[PDB]
PDB file of C-alpha atoms in Angstrom:
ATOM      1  CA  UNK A   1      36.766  77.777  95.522  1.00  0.00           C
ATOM      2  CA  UNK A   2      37.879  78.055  91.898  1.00  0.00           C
ATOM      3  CA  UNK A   3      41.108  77.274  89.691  1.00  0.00           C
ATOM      4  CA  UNK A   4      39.988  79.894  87.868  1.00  0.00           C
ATOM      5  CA  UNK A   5      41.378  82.678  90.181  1.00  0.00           C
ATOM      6  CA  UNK A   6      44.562  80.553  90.812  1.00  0.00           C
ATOM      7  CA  UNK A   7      45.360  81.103  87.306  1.00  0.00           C
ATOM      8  CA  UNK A   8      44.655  84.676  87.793  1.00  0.00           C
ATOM      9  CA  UNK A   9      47.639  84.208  90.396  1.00  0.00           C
ATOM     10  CA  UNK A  10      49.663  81.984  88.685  1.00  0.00           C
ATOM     11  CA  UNK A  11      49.954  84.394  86.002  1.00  0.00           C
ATOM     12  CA  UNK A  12      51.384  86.766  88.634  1.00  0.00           C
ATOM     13  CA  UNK A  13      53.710  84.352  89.861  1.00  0.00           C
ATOM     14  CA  UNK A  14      55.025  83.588  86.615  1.00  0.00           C
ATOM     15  CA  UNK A  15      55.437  87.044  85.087  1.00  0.00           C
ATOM     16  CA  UNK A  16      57.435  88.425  87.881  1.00  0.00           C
ATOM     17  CA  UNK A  17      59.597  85.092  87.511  1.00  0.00           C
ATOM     18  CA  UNK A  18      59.917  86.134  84.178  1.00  0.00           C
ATOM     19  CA  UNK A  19      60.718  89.498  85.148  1.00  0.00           C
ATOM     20  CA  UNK A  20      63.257  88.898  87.687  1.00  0.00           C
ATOM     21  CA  UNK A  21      64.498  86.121  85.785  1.00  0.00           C
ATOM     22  CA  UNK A  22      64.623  88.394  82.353  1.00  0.00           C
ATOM     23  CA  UNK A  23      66.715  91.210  84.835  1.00  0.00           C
ATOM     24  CA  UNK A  24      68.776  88.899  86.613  1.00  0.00           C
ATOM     25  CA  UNK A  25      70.163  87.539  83.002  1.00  0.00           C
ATOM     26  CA  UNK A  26      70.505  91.019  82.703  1.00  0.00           C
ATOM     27  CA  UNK A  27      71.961  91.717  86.182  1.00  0.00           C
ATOM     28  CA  UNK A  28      74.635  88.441  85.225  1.00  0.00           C
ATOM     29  CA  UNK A  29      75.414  89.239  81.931  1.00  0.00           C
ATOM     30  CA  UNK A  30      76.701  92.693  82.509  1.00  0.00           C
ATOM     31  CA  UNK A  31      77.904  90.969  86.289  1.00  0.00           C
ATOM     32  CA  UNK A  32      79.622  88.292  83.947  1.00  0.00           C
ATOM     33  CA  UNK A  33      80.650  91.073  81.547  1.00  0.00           C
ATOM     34  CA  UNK A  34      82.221  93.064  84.721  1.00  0.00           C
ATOM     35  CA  UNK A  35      83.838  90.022  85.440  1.00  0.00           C
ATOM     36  CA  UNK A  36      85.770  89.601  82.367  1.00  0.00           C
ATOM     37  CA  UNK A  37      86.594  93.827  82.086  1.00  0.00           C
ATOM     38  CA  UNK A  38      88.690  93.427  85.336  1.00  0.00           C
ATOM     39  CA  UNK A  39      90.585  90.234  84.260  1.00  0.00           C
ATOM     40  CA  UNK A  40      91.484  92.169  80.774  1.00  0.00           C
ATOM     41  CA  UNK A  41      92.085  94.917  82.315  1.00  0.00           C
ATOM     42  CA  UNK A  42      94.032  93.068  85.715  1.00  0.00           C
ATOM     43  CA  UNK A  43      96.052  90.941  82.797  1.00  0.00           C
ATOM     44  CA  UNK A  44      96.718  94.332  81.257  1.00  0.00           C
ATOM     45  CA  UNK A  45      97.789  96.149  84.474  1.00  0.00           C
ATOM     46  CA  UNK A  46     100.678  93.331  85.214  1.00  0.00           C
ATOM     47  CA  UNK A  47     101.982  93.144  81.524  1.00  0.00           C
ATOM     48  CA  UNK A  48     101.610  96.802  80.586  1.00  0.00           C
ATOM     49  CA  UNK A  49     104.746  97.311  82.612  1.00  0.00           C
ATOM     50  CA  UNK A  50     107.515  99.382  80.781  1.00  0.00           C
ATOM     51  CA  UNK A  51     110.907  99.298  81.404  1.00  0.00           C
ATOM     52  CA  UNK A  52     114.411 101.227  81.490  1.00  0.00           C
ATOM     53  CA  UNK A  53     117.416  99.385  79.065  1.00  0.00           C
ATOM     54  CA  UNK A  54     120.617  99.329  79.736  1.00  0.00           C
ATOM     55  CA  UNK A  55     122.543 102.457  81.208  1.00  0.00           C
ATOM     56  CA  UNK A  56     121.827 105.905  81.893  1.00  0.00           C
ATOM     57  CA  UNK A  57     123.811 108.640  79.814  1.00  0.00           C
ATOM     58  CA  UNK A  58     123.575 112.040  80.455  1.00  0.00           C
ATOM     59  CA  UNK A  59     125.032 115.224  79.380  1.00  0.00           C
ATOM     60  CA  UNK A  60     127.249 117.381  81.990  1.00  0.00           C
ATOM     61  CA  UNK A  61     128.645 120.956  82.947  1.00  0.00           C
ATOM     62  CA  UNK A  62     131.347 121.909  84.591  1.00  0.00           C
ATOM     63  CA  UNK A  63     131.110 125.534  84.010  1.00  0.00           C
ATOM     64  CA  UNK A  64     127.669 125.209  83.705  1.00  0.00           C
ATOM     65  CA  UNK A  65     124.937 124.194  86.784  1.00  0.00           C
ATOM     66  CA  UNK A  66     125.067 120.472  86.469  1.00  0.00           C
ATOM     67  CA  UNK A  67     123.819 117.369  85.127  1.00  0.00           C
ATOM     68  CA  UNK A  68     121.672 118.816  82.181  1.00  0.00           C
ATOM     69  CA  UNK A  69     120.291 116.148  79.884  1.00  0.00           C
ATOM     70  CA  UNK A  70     120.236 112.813  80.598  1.00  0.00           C
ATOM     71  CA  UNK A  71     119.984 109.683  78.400  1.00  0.00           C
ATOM     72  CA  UNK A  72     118.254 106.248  79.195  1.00  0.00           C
ATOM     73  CA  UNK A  73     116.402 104.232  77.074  1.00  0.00           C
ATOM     74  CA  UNK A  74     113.175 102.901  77.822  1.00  0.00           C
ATOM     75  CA  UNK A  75     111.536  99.726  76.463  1.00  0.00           C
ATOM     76  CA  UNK A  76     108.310  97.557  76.812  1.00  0.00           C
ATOM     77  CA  UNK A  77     108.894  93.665  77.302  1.00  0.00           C
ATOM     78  CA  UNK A  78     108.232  91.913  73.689  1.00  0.00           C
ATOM     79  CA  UNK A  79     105.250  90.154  75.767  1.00  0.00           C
ATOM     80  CA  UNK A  80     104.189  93.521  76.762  1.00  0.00           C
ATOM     81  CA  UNK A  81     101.577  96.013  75.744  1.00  0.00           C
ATOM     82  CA  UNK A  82     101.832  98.878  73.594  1.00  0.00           C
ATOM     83  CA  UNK A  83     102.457 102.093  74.867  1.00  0.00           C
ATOM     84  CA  UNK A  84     102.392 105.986  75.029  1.00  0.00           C
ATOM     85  CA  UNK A  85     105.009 108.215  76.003  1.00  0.00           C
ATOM     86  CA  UNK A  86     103.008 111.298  76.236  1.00  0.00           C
ATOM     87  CA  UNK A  87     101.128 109.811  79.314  1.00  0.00           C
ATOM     88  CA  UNK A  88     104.471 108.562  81.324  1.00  0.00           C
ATOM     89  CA  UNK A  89     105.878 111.056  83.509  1.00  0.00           C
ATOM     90  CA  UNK A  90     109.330 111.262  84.974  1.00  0.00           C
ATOM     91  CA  UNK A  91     109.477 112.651  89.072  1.00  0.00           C
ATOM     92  CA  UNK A  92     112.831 113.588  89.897  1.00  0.00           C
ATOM     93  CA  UNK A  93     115.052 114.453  92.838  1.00  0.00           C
ATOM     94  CA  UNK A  94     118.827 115.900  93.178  1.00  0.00           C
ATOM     95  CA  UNK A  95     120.187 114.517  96.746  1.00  0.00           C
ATOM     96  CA  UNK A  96     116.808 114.130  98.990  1.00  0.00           C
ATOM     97  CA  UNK A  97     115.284 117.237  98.028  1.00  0.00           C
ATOM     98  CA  UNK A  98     111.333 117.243  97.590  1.00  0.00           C
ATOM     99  CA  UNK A  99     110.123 115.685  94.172  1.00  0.00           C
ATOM    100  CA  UNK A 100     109.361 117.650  91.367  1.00  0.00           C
ATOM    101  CA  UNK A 101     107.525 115.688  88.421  1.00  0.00           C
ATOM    102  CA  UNK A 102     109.704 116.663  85.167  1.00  0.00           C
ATOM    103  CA  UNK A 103     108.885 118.309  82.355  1.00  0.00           C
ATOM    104  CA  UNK A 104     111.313 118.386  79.050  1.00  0.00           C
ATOM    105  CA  UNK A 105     111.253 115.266  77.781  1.00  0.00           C
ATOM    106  CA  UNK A 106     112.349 114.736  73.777  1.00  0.00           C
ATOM    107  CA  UNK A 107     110.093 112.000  72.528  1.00  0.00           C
ATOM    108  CA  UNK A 108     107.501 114.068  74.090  1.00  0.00           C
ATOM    109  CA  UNK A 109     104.567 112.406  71.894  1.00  0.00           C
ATOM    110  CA  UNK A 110     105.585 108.725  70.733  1.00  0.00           C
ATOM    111  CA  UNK A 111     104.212 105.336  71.247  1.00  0.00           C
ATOM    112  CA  UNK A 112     106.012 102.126  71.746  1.00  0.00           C
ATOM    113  CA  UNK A 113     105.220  99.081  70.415  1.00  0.00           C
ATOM    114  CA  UNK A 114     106.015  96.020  72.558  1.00  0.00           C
ATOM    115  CA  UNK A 115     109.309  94.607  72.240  1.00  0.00           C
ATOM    116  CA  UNK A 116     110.635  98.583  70.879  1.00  0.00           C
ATOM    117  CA  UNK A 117     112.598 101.534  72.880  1.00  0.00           C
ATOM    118  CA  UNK A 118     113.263 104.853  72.231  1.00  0.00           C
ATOM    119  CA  UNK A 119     115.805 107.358  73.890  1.00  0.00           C
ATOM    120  CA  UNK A 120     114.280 109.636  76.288  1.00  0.00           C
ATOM    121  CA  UNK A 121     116.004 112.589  77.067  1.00  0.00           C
ATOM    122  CA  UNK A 122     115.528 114.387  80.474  1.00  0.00           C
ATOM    123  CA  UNK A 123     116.323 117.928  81.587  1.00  0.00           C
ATOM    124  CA  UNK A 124     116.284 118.568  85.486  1.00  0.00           C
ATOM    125  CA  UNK A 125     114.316 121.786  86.406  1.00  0.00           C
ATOM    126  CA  UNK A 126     116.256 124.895  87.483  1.00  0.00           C
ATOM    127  CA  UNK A 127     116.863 123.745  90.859  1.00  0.00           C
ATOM    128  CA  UNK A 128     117.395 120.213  90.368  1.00  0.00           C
ATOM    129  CA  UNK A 129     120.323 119.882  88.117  1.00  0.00           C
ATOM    130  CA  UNK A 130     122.706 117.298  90.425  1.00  0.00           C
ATOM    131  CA  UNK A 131     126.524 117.310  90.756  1.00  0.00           C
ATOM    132  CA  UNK A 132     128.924 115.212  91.049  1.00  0.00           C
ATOM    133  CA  UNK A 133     128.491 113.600  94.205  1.00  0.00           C
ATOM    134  CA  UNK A 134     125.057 114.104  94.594  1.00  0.00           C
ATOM    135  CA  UNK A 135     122.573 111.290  94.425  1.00  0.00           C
ATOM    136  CA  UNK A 136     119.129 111.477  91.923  1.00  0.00           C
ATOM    137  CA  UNK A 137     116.016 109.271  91.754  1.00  0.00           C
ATOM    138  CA  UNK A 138     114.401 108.900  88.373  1.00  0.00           C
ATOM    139  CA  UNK A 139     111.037 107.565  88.915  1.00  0.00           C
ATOM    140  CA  UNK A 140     109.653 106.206  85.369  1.00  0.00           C
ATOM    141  CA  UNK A 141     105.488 105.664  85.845  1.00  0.00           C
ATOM    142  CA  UNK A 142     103.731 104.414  83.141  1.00  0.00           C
ATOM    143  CA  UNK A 143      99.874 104.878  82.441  1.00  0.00           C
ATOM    144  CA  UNK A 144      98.593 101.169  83.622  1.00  0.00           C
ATOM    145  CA  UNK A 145     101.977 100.034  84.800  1.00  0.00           C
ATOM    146  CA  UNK A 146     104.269  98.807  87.284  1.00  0.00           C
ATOM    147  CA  UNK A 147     106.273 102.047  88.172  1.00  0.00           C
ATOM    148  CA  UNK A 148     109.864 101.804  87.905  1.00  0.00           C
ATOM    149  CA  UNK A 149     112.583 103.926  90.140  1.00  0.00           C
ATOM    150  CA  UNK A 150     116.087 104.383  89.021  1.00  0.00           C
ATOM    151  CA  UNK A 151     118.318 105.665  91.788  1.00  0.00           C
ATOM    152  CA  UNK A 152     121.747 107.008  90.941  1.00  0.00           C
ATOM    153  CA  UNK A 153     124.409 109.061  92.167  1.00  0.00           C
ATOM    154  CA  UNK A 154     127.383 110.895  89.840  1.00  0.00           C
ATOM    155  CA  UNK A 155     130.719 109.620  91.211  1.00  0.00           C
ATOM    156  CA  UNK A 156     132.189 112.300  92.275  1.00  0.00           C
ATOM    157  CA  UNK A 157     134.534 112.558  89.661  1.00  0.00           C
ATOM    158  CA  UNK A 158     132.056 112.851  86.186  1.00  0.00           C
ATOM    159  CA  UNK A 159     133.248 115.171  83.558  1.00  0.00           C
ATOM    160  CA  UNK A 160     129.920 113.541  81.850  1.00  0.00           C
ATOM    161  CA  UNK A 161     128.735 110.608  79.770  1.00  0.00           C
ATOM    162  CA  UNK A 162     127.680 107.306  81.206  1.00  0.00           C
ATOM    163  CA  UNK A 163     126.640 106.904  84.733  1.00  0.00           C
ATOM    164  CA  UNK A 164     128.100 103.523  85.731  1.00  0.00           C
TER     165      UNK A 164
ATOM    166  CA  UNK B   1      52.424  78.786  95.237  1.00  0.00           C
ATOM    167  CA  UNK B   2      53.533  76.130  92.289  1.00  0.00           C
ATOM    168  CA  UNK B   3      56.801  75.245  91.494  1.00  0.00           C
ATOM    169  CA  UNK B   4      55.771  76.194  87.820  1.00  0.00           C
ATOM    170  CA  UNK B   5      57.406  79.254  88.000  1.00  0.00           C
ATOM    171  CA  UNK B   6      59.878  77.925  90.658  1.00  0.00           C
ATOM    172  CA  UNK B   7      61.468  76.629  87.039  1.00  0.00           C
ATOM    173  CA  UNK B   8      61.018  79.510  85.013  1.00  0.00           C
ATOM    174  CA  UNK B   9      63.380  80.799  87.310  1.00  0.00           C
ATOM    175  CA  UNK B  10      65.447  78.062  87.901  1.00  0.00           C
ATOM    176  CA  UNK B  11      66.256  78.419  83.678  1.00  0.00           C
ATOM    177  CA  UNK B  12      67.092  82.147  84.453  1.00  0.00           C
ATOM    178  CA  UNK B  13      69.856  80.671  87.377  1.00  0.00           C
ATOM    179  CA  UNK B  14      71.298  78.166  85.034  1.00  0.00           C
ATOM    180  CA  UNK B  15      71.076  80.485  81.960  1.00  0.00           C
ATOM    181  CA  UNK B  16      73.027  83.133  83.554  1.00  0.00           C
ATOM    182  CA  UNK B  17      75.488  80.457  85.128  1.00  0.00           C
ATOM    183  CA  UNK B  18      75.822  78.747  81.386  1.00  0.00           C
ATOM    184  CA  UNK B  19      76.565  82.437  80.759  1.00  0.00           C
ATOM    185  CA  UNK B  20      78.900  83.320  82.994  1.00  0.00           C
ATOM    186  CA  UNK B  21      80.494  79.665  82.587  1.00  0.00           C
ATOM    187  CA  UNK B  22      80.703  80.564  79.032  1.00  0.00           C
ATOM    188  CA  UNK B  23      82.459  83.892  79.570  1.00  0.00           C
ATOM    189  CA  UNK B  24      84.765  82.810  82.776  1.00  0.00           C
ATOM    190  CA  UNK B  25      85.987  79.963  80.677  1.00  0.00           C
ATOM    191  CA  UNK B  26      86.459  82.126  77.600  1.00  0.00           C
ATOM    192  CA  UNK B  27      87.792  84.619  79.893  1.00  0.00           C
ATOM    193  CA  UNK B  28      89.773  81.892  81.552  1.00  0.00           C
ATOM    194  CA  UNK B  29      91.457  80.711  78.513  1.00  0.00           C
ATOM    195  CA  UNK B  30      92.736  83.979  77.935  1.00  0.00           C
ATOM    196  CA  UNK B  31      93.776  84.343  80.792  1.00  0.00           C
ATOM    197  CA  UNK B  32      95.838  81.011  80.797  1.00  0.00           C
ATOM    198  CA  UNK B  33      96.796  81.946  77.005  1.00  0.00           C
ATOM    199  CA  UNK B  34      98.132  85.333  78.466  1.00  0.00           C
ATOM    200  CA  UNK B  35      99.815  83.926  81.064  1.00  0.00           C
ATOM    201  CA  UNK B  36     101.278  81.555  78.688  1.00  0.00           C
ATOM    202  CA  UNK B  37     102.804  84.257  76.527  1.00  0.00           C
ATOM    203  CA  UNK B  38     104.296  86.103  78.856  1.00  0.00           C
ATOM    204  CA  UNK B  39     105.926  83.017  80.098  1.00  0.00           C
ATOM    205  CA  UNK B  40     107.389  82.570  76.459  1.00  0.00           C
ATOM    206  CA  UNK B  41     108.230  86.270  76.137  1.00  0.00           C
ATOM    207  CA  UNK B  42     109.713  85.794  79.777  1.00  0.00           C
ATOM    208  CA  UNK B  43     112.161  83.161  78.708  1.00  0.00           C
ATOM    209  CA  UNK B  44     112.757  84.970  75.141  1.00  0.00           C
ATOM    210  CA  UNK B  45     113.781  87.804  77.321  1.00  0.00           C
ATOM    211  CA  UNK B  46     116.374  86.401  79.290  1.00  0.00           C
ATOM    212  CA  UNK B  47     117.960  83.533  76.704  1.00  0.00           C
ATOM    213  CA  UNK B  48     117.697  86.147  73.424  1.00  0.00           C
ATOM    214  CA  UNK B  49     120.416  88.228  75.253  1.00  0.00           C
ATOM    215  CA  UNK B  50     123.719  88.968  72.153  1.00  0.00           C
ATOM    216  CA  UNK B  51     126.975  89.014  73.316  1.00  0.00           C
ATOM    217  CA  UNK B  52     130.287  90.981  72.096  1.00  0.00           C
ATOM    218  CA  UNK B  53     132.748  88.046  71.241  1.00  0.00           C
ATOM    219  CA  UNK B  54     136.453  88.657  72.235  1.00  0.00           C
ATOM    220  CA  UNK B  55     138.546  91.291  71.303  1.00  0.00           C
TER     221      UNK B  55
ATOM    222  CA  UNK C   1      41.622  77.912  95.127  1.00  0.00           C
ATOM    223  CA  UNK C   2      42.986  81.460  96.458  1.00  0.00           C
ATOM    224  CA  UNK C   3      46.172  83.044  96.252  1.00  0.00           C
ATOM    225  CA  UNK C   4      45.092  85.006  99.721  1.00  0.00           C
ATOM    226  CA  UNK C   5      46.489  81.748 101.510  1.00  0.00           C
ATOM    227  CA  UNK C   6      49.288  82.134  98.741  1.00  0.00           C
ATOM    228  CA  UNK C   7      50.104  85.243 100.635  1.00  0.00           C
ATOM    229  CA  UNK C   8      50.187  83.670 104.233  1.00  0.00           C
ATOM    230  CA  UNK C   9      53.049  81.587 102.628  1.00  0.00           C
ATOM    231  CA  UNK C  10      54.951  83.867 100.099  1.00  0.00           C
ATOM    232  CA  UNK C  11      55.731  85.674 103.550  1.00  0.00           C
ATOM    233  CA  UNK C  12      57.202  82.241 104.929  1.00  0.00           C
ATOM    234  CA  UNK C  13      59.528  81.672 102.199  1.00  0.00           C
ATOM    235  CA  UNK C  14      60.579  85.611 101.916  1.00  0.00           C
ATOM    236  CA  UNK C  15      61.429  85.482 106.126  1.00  0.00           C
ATOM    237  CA  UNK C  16      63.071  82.263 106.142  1.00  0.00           C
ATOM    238  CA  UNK C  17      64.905  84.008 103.584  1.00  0.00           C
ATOM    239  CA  UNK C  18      65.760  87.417 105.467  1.00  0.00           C
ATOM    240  CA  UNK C  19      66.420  85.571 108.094  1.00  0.00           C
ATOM    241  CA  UNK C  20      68.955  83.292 106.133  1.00  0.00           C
ATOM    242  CA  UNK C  21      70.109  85.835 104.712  1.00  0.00           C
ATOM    243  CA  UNK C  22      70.625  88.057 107.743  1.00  0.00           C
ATOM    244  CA  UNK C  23      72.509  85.460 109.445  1.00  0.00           C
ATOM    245  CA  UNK C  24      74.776  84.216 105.972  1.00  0.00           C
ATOM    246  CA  UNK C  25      75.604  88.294 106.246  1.00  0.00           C
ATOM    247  CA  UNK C  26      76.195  87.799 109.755  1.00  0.00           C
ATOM    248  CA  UNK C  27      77.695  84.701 109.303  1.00  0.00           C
ATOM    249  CA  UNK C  28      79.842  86.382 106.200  1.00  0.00           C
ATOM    250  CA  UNK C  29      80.781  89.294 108.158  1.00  0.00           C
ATOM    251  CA  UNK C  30      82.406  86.825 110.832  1.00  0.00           C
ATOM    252  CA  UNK C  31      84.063  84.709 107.935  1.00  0.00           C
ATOM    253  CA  UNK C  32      85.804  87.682 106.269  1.00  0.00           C
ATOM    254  CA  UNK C  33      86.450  89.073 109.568  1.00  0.00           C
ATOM    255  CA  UNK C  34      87.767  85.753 110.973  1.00  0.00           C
ATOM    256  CA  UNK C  35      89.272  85.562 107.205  1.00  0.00           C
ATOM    257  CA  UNK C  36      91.130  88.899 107.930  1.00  0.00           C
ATOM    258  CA  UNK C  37      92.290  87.824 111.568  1.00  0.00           C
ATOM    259  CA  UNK C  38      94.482  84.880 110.185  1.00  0.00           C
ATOM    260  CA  UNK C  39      96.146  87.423 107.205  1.00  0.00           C
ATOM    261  CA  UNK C  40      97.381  90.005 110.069  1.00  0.00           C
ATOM    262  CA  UNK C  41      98.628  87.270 112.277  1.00  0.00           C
ATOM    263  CA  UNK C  42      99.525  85.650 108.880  1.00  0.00           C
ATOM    264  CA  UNK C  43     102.224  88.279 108.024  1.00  0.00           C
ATOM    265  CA  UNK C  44     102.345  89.169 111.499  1.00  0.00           C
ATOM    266  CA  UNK C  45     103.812  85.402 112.307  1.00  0.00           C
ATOM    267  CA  UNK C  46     106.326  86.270 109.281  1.00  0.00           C
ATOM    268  CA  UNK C  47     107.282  89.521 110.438  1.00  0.00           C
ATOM    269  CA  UNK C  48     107.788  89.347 113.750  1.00  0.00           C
ATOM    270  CA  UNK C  49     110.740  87.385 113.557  1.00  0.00           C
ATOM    271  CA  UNK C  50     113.740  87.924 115.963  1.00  0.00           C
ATOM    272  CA  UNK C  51     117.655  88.050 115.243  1.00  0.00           C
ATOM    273  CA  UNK C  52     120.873  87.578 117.092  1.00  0.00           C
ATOM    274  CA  UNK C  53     123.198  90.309 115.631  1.00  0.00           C
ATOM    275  CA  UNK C  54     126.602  90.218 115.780  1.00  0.00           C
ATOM    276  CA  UNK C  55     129.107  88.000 118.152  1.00  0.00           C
TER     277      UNK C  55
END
C-alpha cells in the first residue's frame, strides 16, 4: 500500500473543498449581499412613507353634482425618501359605496423631494361626487409606503372650501 | 480522509463569515445611522412647528 | 494507503450528517412550530381579555 495513490485522493478531497468552498463564498456573498438588499430596502419601506399636511380643501356645487375638486396637500417627512407622484394612487368612496381608484389628479407627473409638498387636486368620478352630509374616504398609497386613509364627511351645511 | 482539506474549507466558513461580518456590520451601521436620522428628523418634525402670534 | 477505505468513512461522516440534519429539521420544525404556539397564545393571552360594561 502506497502514499502515492493517497495523493491521487487527496487531490480529490482538496479540489472539491476548493470547489465547494470557492461556491459557498459565492453562495454567502450574494446570501450576505441578499442580506443587506432587504435591510435597504426594509429601512426604505418604513421611511418612504408620505404624508397628507394640514387640511383638506375642496371645491363645491350647489347647482352642480357635488364635491368636485378637492385640495390637500401631500408631503414626505424631511427624514423621508424621495418620491413620485405619478406612481401614488388615490381610491375613493362617497358614503360606503364600493371603491373606485381615482383618476384626475393635477400634479399628475411630479416628484417630491423629502421634506417638500405639493397640492394635489382630486376630481371624484361621475358617480362619486359626495354631498353635504355624505361621508368620503381618501385613501393616499404610495409606491414603497405606509398607506395613508383620510376619512371625511361634508357637514351638512358646506357651500364649499375647507373641510374642518 | 485528512483534515488538510478539512481547513481549506474551514478558510471558506470563516471567509464568508468575515464577509458577511463585514457587510452586516456595514449594513448594521447604516442601519443604526438610519435609524438615527429619522430619530433627528422625528424630533425636527414635531419641535420645528411656526406659530401665528396674537392678533 | 487507499482512499477505498476513505469511502467506507466519507459515508460515516455524510449519515451522521443526514441524520443530524434530519433531526435539527425535525428538531427545527418543532422549534418554529413550538415558536408559533407561544405567538397565538401570545396575542391570544392579550386579546382575550374580558370587560364589565356599564353599572
Amino acid at each position: 500500500f502506497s502514499g502515492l495513490e493517497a495523493a491521487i485522493v487527496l487531490i480529490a478531497f482538496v479540489v472539491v473543498a476548493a470547489v465547494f468552498s470557492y461556491v459557498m463564498l459565492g453562495a454567502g456573498f450574494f446570501a450576505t449581499q441578499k442580506s443587506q438588499e432587504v435591510t435597504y430596502s426594509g429601512m426604505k419601506q418604513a421611511t418612504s412613507n408620505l404624508i397628507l399636511d394640514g387640511m383638506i380643501y375642496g371645491s363645491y356645487s350647489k347647482g352642480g353634482s357635488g364635491l368636485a375638486q378637492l385640495y390637500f396637500y401631500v408631503k414626505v417627512p424631511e427624514g423621508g425618501e424621495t418620491q413620485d407622484l405619478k406612481y401614488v394612487t388615490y381610491l375613493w368612496t362617497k358614503e360606503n359605496k364600493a371603491v373606485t381608484t381615482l383618476t384626475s389628479i393635477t400634479p399628475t407627473n411630479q416628484q417630491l423631494n423629502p421634506g417638500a409638498r405639493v397640492k394635489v387636486t382630486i376630481t371624484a368620478p361621475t358617480g362619486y361626487k359626495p354631498i353635504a352630509g355624505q361621508k368620503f374616504v381618501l385613501e393616499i398609497k404610495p409606491k414603497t409606503g405606509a398607506s395613508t386613509i383620510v376619512t371625511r364627511t361634508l357637514s351638512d351645511g358646506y357651500n364649499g372650501g375647507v373641510i374642518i
